[PDB]
Each structure stands twice: as structure tokens, then as C-alpha cells.
Amino acid sequence: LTPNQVNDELNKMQAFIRKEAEEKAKEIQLKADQEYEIEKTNIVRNETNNID
Amino acid sequence: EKEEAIFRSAEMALVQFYIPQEISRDSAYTLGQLGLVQFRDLNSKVRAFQRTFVNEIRRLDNVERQYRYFYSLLKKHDIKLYEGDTDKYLDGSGELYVPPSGSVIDDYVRNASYLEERLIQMEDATDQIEVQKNDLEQYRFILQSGDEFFVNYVTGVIARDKVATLEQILWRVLRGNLFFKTVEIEQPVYDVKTREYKHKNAFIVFSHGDLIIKRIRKIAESLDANLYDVDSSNEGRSQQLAKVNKNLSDLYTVLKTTSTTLESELYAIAKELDSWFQDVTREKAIFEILNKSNYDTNRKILIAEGWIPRDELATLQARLGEMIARLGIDVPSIIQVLDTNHTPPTFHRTNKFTAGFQSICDCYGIAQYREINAGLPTIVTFPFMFAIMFGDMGHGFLMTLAALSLVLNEKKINKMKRGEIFDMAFTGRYIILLMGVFSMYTGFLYNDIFSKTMTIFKSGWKWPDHWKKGESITATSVGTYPIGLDWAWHGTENALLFSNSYKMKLSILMGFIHMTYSYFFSLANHLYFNSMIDIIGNFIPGLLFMQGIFGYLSVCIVYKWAVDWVKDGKPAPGLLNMLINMFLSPGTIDDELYPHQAKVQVFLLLMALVCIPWLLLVKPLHFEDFGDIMIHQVIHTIEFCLNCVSHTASYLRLWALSLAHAQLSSVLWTMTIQIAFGFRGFVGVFMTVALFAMWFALTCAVLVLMEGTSAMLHSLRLHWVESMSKFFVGEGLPYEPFAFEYKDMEV
Amino acid sequence: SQKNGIATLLQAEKEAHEIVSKARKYRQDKLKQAKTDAAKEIDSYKIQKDKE
Numbered sequence: 001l002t003p004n005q006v007n008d009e010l011n012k013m014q015a016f017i018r019k020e021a022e023e024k025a026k027e028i029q030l031k032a033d034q035e036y037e038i039e040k041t042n043i044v045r046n047e048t049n050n051i052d
Numbered sequence: 053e054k055e056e057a058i059f060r061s062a063e064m065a066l067v068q069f070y071i072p073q074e075i076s077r078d079s080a081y082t083l084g085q086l087g088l089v090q091f092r093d094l095n096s097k098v099r100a101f102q103r104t105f106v107n108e109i110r111r112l113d114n115v116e117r118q119y120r121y122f123y124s125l126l127k128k129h130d131i132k133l134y135e136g137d138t139d140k141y142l143d144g145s146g147e148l149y150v151p152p153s154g155s156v157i158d159d160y161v162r163n164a165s166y167l168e169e170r171l172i173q174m175e176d177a178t179d180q181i182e183v184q185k186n187d188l189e190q191y192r193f194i195l196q197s198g199d200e201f202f203v204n205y206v207t208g209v210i211a212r213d214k215v216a217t218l219e220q221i222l223w224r225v226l227r228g229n230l231f232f233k234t235v236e237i238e239q240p241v242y243d244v245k246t247r248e249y250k251h252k253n254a255f256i257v258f259s260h261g262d263l264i265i266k267r268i269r270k271i272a273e274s275l276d277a278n279l280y281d282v283d284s285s286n287e288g289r290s291q292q293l294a295k296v297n298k299n300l301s302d303l304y305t306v307l308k309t310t311s312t313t314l315e316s317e318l319y320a321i322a323k324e325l326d327s328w329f330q331d332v333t334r335e336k337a338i339f340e341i342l343n344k345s346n347y348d349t350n351r352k353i354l355i356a357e358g359w360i361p362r363d364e365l366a367t368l369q370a371r372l373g374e375m376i377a378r379l380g381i382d383v384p385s386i387i388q389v390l391d392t393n394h395t396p397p398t399f400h401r402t403n404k405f406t407a408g409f410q411s412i413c414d415c416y417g418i419a420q421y422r423e424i425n426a427g428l429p430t431i432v433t434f435p436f437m438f439a440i441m442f443g444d445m446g447h448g449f450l451m452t453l454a455a456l457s458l459v460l461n462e463k464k465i466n467k468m469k470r471g472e473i474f475d476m477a478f479t480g481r482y483i484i485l486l487m488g489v490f491s492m493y494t495g496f497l498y499n500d501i502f503s504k505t506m507t508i509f510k511s512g513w514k515w516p517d518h519w520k521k522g523e524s525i526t527a528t529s530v531g532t533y534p535i536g537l538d539w540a541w542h543g544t545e546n547a548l549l550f551s552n553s554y555k556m557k558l559s560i561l562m563g564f565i566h567m568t569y570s571y572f573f574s575l576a577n578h579l580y581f582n583s584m585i586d587i588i589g590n591f592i593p594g595l596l597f598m599q600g601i602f603g604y605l606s607v608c609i610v611y612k613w614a615v616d617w618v619k620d621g622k623p624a625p626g627l628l629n630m631l632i633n634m635f636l637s638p639g640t641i642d643d644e645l646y647p648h649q650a651k652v653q654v655f656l657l658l659m660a661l662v663c664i665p666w667l668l669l670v671k672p673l674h675f676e677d678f679g680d681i682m683i684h685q686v687i688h689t690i691e692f693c694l695n696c697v698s699h700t701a702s703y704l705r706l707w708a709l710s711l712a713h714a715q716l717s718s719v720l721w722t723m724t725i726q727i728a729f730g731f732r733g734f735v736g737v738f739m740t741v742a743l744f745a746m747w748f749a750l751t752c753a754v755l756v757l758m759e760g761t762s763a764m765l766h767s768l769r770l771h772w773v774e775s776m777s778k779f780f781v782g783e784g785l786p787y788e789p790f791a792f793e794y795k796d797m798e799v
Numbered sequence: 800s801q802k803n804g805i806a807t808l809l810q811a812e813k814e815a816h817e818i819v820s821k822a823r824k825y826r827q828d829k830l831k832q833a834k835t836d837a838a839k840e841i842d843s844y845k846i847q848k849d850k851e
Contacts, residue, residue, distance in 0.1 A: 001369065001384055006800045007807070009383040013072075014811035017352060021815030025822035032826035036833045043837035044844070051845045068801060351808055388800060 053363060054401065059576055061422040062400050063363065064787075065389040066092065069356035073347065076354060078379050080338045081152045082371065086145050088789045090397075091358040093344045105343040111161060112336040118164045119329050123797065125171065126322070131315065134322050139794045142330065148374070150334070150792055157335055160328065167321075175314070178307055183244065185303045191296060193237070194254060194280055198289040202231035205258040206268045207280050211243075212236075212251045214275060222257075222268075231258050245276075330795045341790045359397060359787070360387070396421040398784025406431075408480030416772050420782025424577050426570075426775055433566060434771050435486040436494075440559075440706060441763035442713035443495020446502055447756055452488035455481060487760075497536040503718040511538035553627070555707050557609060563703030563774075564602050570775040571595070589670045593663050593689075594778075598696045600660035604653070605630075608645060664689075692778070699774050705766060713759060720747075720755060 055061060071079055083089050100106055126133060142150075194209060210218055219232060237252035259265065272279060283289050345356035360368070365387065376384050398419050402410040409430045419425055458465065458481045470478050499505040513527035524546075532538050541547035571594070578587040608630065617624035625643035630653075633641050639654045671685050728743040730736050 003385075003388075006385050006388060007803055009385065010070075010800055010804050010807045013352075013381075013383060014807050017811045018814055018818075021818055025818045028819070028822040029825055032822070032829040035826065036829050036836070039830070039833040040836045040840070043833075044840040047837070047841045048844055048848075051841070051848055070800070070804060351812060353808065390801070 057425065057427045058573075059424070059580055061424065061577075061580065062361070062398065063422070064359065064361040064396060064399075066357065066359045066392065066396075067387050067389050069345070069358065069386050070353045070383075071356060071386050072381055072383060073352055073354045075375070075379060075381065076342055077338070078152065079375065080342050081150055082148075082374060084334075084338050084341075084790050084792070085147075085149045086789065086791060087368070087371070088361045088364060088787075089358060090360075090787055090789060091341070091344050091356070094346050094355075094357055095344045103343065104347065105339065108339060109336070112332065112339075115161050115164050115332060116336070118168050119325070119332070121168070122321075122325055125175070126318070126325075129314075129318070131318050131322065133326060135326050136323070138327060139330070142792060143794050147371070153331075153335070157332070160332065171317075174310060177310060181303060181306050181310075185300065186241065186244075188296060188300055188303070190241070190278070191280060192293065195282060195289055195293050195296070197235055197254065197256065198282075198286055198293075200233060200235060200256055201258060202233050203281075204262075204265070204284070205256075206265055206272070207256060207282050208272055209237075209252065209254040209278050209280075211276055212253045215253050215255075218275065225267075225271075226259070226264065232256075330792075333795055334792055338790070361399075362389075395782075395784070397787050398423060399787030400425055400427075405482045408483045411479075412768070414786070416776055417780055418784045418786060419780045420784045422577065422580055423780065423782045423784065424573055424580075426779055429570065429775055429779075430771070431486075433775075434767050435483070435490050437706065437767035437770055438487050438760075438763050439490030439494040441709050441767065442759060443491050443493075443498055443710075444500060444502065444713070444717055445492060445495055446751070448488045448491035448495060450752065451484060451491070451756065451760070455484040455488060459485065487764075498714075499536050499539065500714065500717070503714075503721045505539050505542060507539045509533045509535070509538070511540060513538075513540050552707075552711060555710065556704065557627075559703050559707040560700070561606055561609065563706075563770075564606055564700070567699055567774055568599075570779055571598075573779060586670060586674070590667060590685075593667055594692060596663065597660055597693065600656055602696075602700065604656065611645065695777060699777075702770065702774070706770070709763060709766065716755065720750065724750075 095103065190209070194207065215234075222230065222232065232255070234253060234255040237254055240249060240252040242249045257268065259268075269279070283292055345354060347354050368387070369384070372384060372386075376382065398421050400410075406427075410427065413425060413427060413430055458478070462481065465478060499508070511532045512530045515525060515527060519525055527540065537551075541551055574591055574594070575588065578584065578591075612624065622644050625645050629643050630641065630645070633643070634653060634657055639650055641650045641653070667685060667689050668682065671681055724743060724747045728740050728747075730739060732739070
């Protein structure tokens with residue numbers, strides 16, 4: 001529309017993609033926590049069973 | 053919101069696009085309807101396999117091959133292809149004329165890939181089921197001869213074409229000892245090698261020797277033969293007949309069943325296959341055209357460039373209002389004009405009434421950017437040229453009759469199929485109208501209607517009380533027709549030798565006026581460019597050289613038209629005698645057109661000639677210098693200096709054709725009407741009828757068709773090589789916005 | 800745009816890549832933490848059984 005507005009369609013979409021990737025990464029960190037949980041529980045179970 | 057066709061040209065722009073990648077197809081549906089949109093193909097120096105869209109093109113190729121097979125299987129059957137009126141809904145200029153189509157394109161691919169084998173496996177059965185039926189039926193008639201005799205014996209059936217030779221070779225290979233009786237095939241049947249109803253015969257044979265049996269068996273096949281086996285007993289043959297007869301009703305019915313399926317599904321598919329054809333074509337084309345842009349995974353945006361008109365940015369934004377309406381992502385502007393160093397394309401608009409006129413404008417060639425187009429010159433001059441080619445009242449009126457019929461029937465002709473000979477005819481239906489409406493006027497001044505004249509006005513001419521022909525009779529003038537020429541020039545060769553001289557001058561004068569008018573547009577575009585630094589430095593000689601001679605000759609010509617010479621002591625100077633004097637003499641005219649003109653004609657000539665090298669010095673004075681440009685301007689100087697006179701000379705063909713038409717019309721009239729004048733009411737009326745009919749046959753056919761066909765192309769000459777020589781001094785590449793269109797039967 | 804898009808869009812895209820790779824390296828450090836967590840669970844409970 002207005003020529004001066006051509007920077008807004010850049011910066012707002014920059015923010016939109018940034019927040020998309022930010023949510024993706026912040027849930028990937030939760031996935032990392034879940035991986036932590038399972039690979040901790042299974043290893044400790046397997047070792048402690050022989051200890052028992 | 054357009055151009056004036058005289059000074060205002062088309063003005064446009066280019067930008068770098070930053071469109072989101074996800075709405076590529078979405079944007080394409082919209083801009084593909086009517087957007088005045090073209091792309092600068094940055095996707096260059098790349099191969100098909102070097103491109104990121106080769107995968108879908110082969111899929112659409114396979115489905116269109118499937119559609120071609122659909123064409124084939126359709127036309128090979130009597131059913132007619134229904135075509136709905138949806139093409140009008142799909143061809144035209146609107147606002148959302150192409151509604152967006154979902155991604156069910158792959159569903160179309162799927163169901164097509166399904167139907168292909170669905171129909172192949174169902175159709176490839178009849179070819180067998182029929183031959184099995186035929187073979188069983190043949191076996192049946194073979195067995196029908198159970199009471200005809202005379203492993204242990206051989207049975208078969210052969211065409212009558214070899215019955216005699218076969219029986220003879222049997223008789224002369226088994227050595228004259230055999231039983232061989234036969235019965236003919238009543239109501240024969242077709243063969244299988246050539247599908248031909250060949251007359252047939254069946255035979256029966258018996259012998260004692262088994263060696264004989266094997267010899268017969270292994271000789272029969274070498275020739276056109278069929279083999280079978282039959283029981284010797286009689287009731288055994290009856291049981292064979294019953295068992296082989298039981299299993300043929302199924303064969304009789306299966307073909308009917310498969311047909312019932314075939315036509316049933318053909319009816320349904322026909323309603324949609326035609327539409328889907330052009331539909332899927334639209335998707336392949338739109339994918340292709342969008343594919344010319346550059347994309348990488350680097351950025352979510354898509355790197356694209358294209359070349360867009362500049363006087364419709366507001367309309368483009370409003371139309372993209374839909375982009376932000378339903379599929380909105382809030383990146384509205386994708387337009388930002390930058391600058392380049394290459395010449396922009398040239399393009400303009402067209403209209404229904406000007407289908408033919410505008411085509412011929414760029415058929416010769418396109419003009420460069422902001423270079424004036426000769427639309428109005430084509431509208432005016434070419435029709436007037438054709439009109440002045442010939443002006444018989446009857447011929448012009450008759451030609452216009454067809455034009456009126458075509459224009460009034462255009463209500464349905466616009467939609468009905470245009471015949472091979474009618475395509476171009478319908479293309480320029482509005483041109484012949486102008487042709488004729490100017491032809492009737494041009495011929496009006498000639499006062500010719502099939503070489504006749506009713507003496508509309510009065511001029512007054514002097515004759516004695518009585519006069520016997522064979523003598524030259526002088527009639528003085530007291531005022532001629534205010535409009536046109538008087539009837540007095542309908543007499544002997546004097547009239548023709550005056551009319552030819554009169555007419556050969558106006559042609560030259562009008563040609564000079566027309567070429568001056570065309571050259572007048574030279575500085576128009578340069579002012580449009582504001583390129584006045586040195587362009588006038590070349591327009592000046594190109595004007596003065598031609599004018600100082602041609603305008604001087606024209607003004608001299610009109611000078612005698614005003615002043616008489618019989619009443620003046622000075623005799624009338626020759627029509628063209630002021631040429632040699634300008635060079636051999638230092639100013640001596642010897643024609644005495646005007647005293648003072650003698651001392652100024654050479655002066656005008658010497659100003660005219662002196663600036664010959666004024667063009668070869670201006671170019672090097674720019675600072676720098678390079679050989680090709682001096683060579684180019686030298687060749688331009690010489691070519692123009694010769695082209696002025698070439699054009700001057702070329703204008704006589706107009707009058708040559710005019711007088712040729714007049715003479716042929718006169719001679720045809722003389723050889724038709726005078727012959728028809730045979731006075732007889734018992735057999736002469738029928739002779740008059742026949743002559744009248746053939747006179748129409750010739751007038752309409754050969755005194756119009758060939759003449760007009762030649763005249764239009766001679767006018768095309770007279771327009772092109774004259775105007776465009778110095779008018780279209782540049783070339784611009786065409787603009788062709790991507791848009792939907794219909795497709796139909798073809799390879 | 801061009802006078803600013805080449806920079807703003809790069810800020811968006813490389814920022815997204817940086818945060819995503821930050822999540823990835825977080826998950827790798829998290830895998831190391833899971834290994835050492837199984838270790839510390841078998842470094843204490845293993846001897847805890849003998850304590851009881």
C-alpha cells in the first residue's frame with residue numbers, strides 16, 4: 001500500500017517466523033527432557049536390577 | 053486511463069518480488085485471470101533436470117497422454133462429444149474469472165490412472181470373444197454335413213479361391229485315387245487374416261493310408277486352411293453338435309453385456325472429460341509459468357521478477373485485496389520499482405473492432421519503448437489507399453453488402469466455428485466496411501457506375517447547331533462541376549489523355565503529403581523522450597533536403613493550377629521541365645514560371661545541398677568516436693537520400709491500378725451490354741437472361757476478388773515501406789499476460 | 800524490500816536457526832546429563848542397597 005509500509009511486512013513476518021521457531025525449539029527442549037526421563041529411568045532400572 | 057495514440061505511449065515498470073512461498077499457487081490463480089503480468093525469466097542457463105519442478109510436469113504429461121487416449125477411444129465410437137457452455141464462463145475478462153481450485157488435482161490424476169486400466173481390461177475382451185464365437189459357429193456348420201462321405205480321415209475347410217488348385221494338387225500328389233466330395237458354404241462369413249467376407253467352401257476327404265493322412269495334414273496348413281476333427285459315427289456327431297451348441301449363448305450375450313457397460317460409462321464421462329482437459333491444461337500452464345522464478349530454501353519468500361504496466365498499480369493493489377481478504381497473511385505490497393540498463397518492452401491495447409488493424413501494426417514489427425505506434429495511420433491511410441485504388445459504385449456497394457451481412461450476423465458468427473477460408477475474413481470484418489465506405493466516395497468524383505454517368509450537375513459546353521461526327525469539336529468552359537469531374541470527359545481519346553494527366557499528378561501530391569505527415573512524427577517521440585541534445589541535429593537535414601525540392605515542385609505545380617496561360621502572353625510551361633535547368637544553367641530557367649524565382653531557385657538549392665556533410669560531422673563531435681557509428685550514419689544518410697526519391701517514384705502504382713480498373717470495367721461493359729442488346733422477343737429474351745447472369749457471375753467473381761486482393765496488398769506496400777521506414781526506428785519485445793483459453797481436438 | 804529486506808529477513812532466518820541449534824545442543828548436553836544421571840543413580844542406590 002503505502003511505500004513506507006514495505007518494512008512492516010518484513011519485520012512483522014520476521015517476528016512471526018522467529019516465534020514459530022521459538023515455540024518449535026522450546027518444545028524440542030521438552031522433548032529433550034522426555035528423552036532424559038526415559039534414558040535415565042531405563043538405564044537405572046537395568047543396572048539396579050542386577051545390583052538387587 | 054489510456055494513450056492518445058499520437059504522443060502518449062505505454063509506460064510500465066519492473067520490480068523484484070518478495071512473495072511468500074506458500075501462496076505461490078494462490079497468487080497464480082488470481083494474477084492468471086487478467087493481470088497484465090509477464091516475467092523476466094531469471095531461470096536461464098539451466099536444464100530441465102537442473103530445475104526444481106520437473107517432477108509434476110511428467111505427471112501432468114502422463115495424465116494428458118491419458119486424455120489423448122481418451123480422445124482416441126471416444127472418436128473410434130459413434131458417440132458424440134458433448135461440449136457445455138462452460139467455456140464462455142472460463143474464457144473472458146472478469147474480476148475472479150478463474151475461481152481457485154483446490155489440490156484435488158492429484159485426485160484427478162488418481163481417478164484417471166484408475167479409469168485407464170479400468171477401460172483397457174474391459175475393452176480388450178471383445179476381440180477374443182468374437183473370434184471364439186466365429187470359430188465355434190464355423191465348427192457347427194462343418195458338423196452340419198454329417199451325412200456326406202464316400203484320426204483315420206482328414207477334415208477341413210478352404211476358400212473357393214483355391215478349391216480347384218487344391219483338389220488338382222491332391223489328385224496329382226496322391227496319384228488319381230481318392231474320395232473327395234464337398235458341399236458349398238451357404239451364406240459365407242468373413243475371414244480372420246484380413247476381415248473380409250470371402251466366399252467359402254467346405255470339403256470332406258477320406259483315404260486308407262495313415263501316411264496319406266499325415267501328408268495331407270502337413271500340406272493343408274502351408275496353404276490357407278483350417279483344421280478340425282469329427283467323429284466317424286453319426287449319433288456321435290449329433291452328440292458333438294449338442295455339446296458344442298450348449299456353450300454359445302454365453303458368448304452371444306457377453307459382448308452385449310460389455311457394450312452395455314461401455315456406452316453407459318461413455319455417456320457419463322463425456323460430460324466431464326472435455327472440461328477436465330482444458331482444466332488440467334490450466335494447471336500445467338500455470339505451474340510452468342510460475343516455475344520461471346528462482347527459489348531456494350534460504351528464505352521463506354520466493355525470488356521472482358516480472359515486468360508490469362505502470363498505469364494500473366492501483367488496480368493491481370485492489371485485486372490483491374483478495375490476497376489479503378480470505379488467504380490473508382498480511383504482506384500486501386510485493387511491488388518496488390528499481391532501474392535497469394536494458395530497453396523496456398513495448399506493448400499497447402487492442403479492441404474487437406480493430407482485430408485486423410492492430411495485428412498488421414506489429415506484424416511488420418514491434419516498436420521500441422516509448423516509440424509511437426501507427427495505429428491511426430493504419431486506421432486512415434490504408435483504407436483511403438484501397439479506396440483510391442478503384443471506385444466503381446456497384447462494386448463498392450456489393451462488397452459492403454457482405455460486410456453488413458457479416459457484421460449483423462456477428463451475433464452468432466462470433467461463436468460459431470469459423471471456416472478455414474472464413475477465419476481471416478471474420479477477423480477483419482470491420483475493415484472491409486471502411487474499405488467500401490471510402491471506395492464509394494473516391495469513385496464518386498470519378499462519376500463512374502459501370503462506366504456510366506447520369507450527369508448529376510451541369511458544367512456547360514459549347515457545340516454548334518449541327519455537327520457530323522468524325523470531326524474534333526471544341527467546347528469552351530464556363531465553370532465545371534463544383535464536386536467531381538463533368539461528364540464532358542466521356543468522349544473520345546482526348547478525354548482519356550486529359551484525365552490520365554490530371555490524375556497522375558494528384559497521386560504524387562497526395563503521396564508527398566502523406567510522407568510529410570508520417571515524417572512529422574519523428575520529433576514527436578524524441579520530445580516524448582526529451583532527447584533534444586542532438587536528435588534535431590539529424591532531423592534537420594532529413595527535413596530540409598526533402599522539402600526544398602518536393603515542396604518547391606508541389607508549390608510550382610499548384611501555381612499553374614491557379615494562373616491561366618491562354619490569356620497571358622507567357623505560354624504554359626511544361627508539366628515537368630524545371631529539372632535540368634537547375635544544374636546545367638547557373639540559374640537560367642527558360643520556362644518563365646516567375647522572374648524573381650529564377651535567382652532564388654538556385655539559392656534554395658545551394659542551401660539544401662550544403663548540409664550534406666552536416667551529418668557526418670555532428671556524430672564525431674560527441675565526446676567520443678567509434679568506427680561503426682560513423683559507418684552507420686553514413687549508410688543512413690545515403691539510404692534516406694535515396695529513399696525519399698524511391699518513395700516519390702513508388703506512388704504512381706496507385707493511379708496505374710486505378711486506370712487499369714477503369715479500363716477493364718469499361719471493356720467488360722462494352723462486351724456484355726452491347727451483346728445483350730440483340731433485339732428479339734422470341735429467343736432474344738432468354739439470351740439476355742443468360743448474358744445478364746454471366747455478367748453478374750464475372751462482375752462479382754473476377755472483377756472484384758482479384759482486384760481487391762491485389763489492391764489491399766499494394767496498399768500494405770505503400771503504407772509499410774514508406775511510413776515504417778522512418779517511423780518504427782526501433783523494436784520492442786511483445787507483452788503477453790498469462791491468461792486462460794480454450795483447447796479442442798488436435799494431435 | 801531490498802535496501803533492508805536482505806538484513807531483516809536474515810535476522811529472522813539466522814535467529815531461527817540459532818535458536819533451533821541451541822535446542823539441539825541443549826538436547827545433546829541433555830543426553831550427556833542422562834548418561835551421568837544413570838551413573839549417579841547407580842553411584843548411590845547401588846551402594847544404598849548394601850547400606851540396607
